[PDB]
Amino acid sequence: MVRNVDVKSRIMDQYADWKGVRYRLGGSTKKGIDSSGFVQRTFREQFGLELPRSTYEQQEMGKSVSRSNLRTGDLVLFRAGSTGRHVGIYIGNNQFVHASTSSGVIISSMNEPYWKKRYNEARRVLS
């Protein structure tokens, strides 16, 4: 559907500009960024939607979405890492973009064992 193709294209536009930027806690620039930071930054610049700064605040925005109802643009939240939460952006086909600790800004599959075991919730913040 054209709605989801346009939304994905804009997220990947952001991804393409940020791929490889290293993980840094509390960072918000191309010198280094964390998971909530990359999300807040993407939605601000690509969709004009202001999200709060941290994972726990973003987990409250919008409307909860069940794992089987995931749509492109939804936030995906995992009980992962030392802050206790990790957030990415679903992009279809069981994939999401995020500021990974191990690799910086990357695309990952929700079916990778590490992320699968720690899945916590989805939030829809566009609609």
Distance of CA 116 to the CA centre of its chain: 15
Q: Which of 76, 6, 94, 92 is nearest to 36 (CA)?
A: 76
Q: How far apart are CA 94 and CA 70, in angstroms?
A: 9
For residue 127 the two structure tokens come to 């609609």
Mutual angle of helices 2-18 and 35-47, in 10-degree steps: 120
**What residues are paired with 119 via a beta bridge?**
78
**Solved how?**
X-ray
Q: Which residue has the tokens 């930071």?
A: 37
Instruction: Please report the sign of the dihedral spanned by the C-alpha atoms of residue 71, residue 112, residue 38, residue 85.
Output: positive
Q: State the maximum Cα–Cα separation within the chain, in Å, rounded to a whole number.
A: 38
Our CA angle for 104, 106, 110, nearest 5°, is 120
Rg of the chain over CA atoms, in angstroms? 13
Exposed, middle or buried: residue 67 (CB in 10 Å: 0-12, 13-18, 19+)? Answer: exposed
Angle at 48 between CA 43 and CA 50, to 5 degrees: 65
Q: Could you tell me which residues come within 8 angstroms of residue 60 by beta carbon, excluding any fewer than 6 positions away?
A: 123
d(CA 4, CA 7) in angstroms, rounded, equals 5
Secondary structure (3-state) at 32: strand
* C-alpha distance from residue 91 to each of 9, 12, 71, 76, 96 (Å): 9, 9, 8, 10, 5
Do the Cβ atoms of 123 and 64 come closer than 8 Å? yes
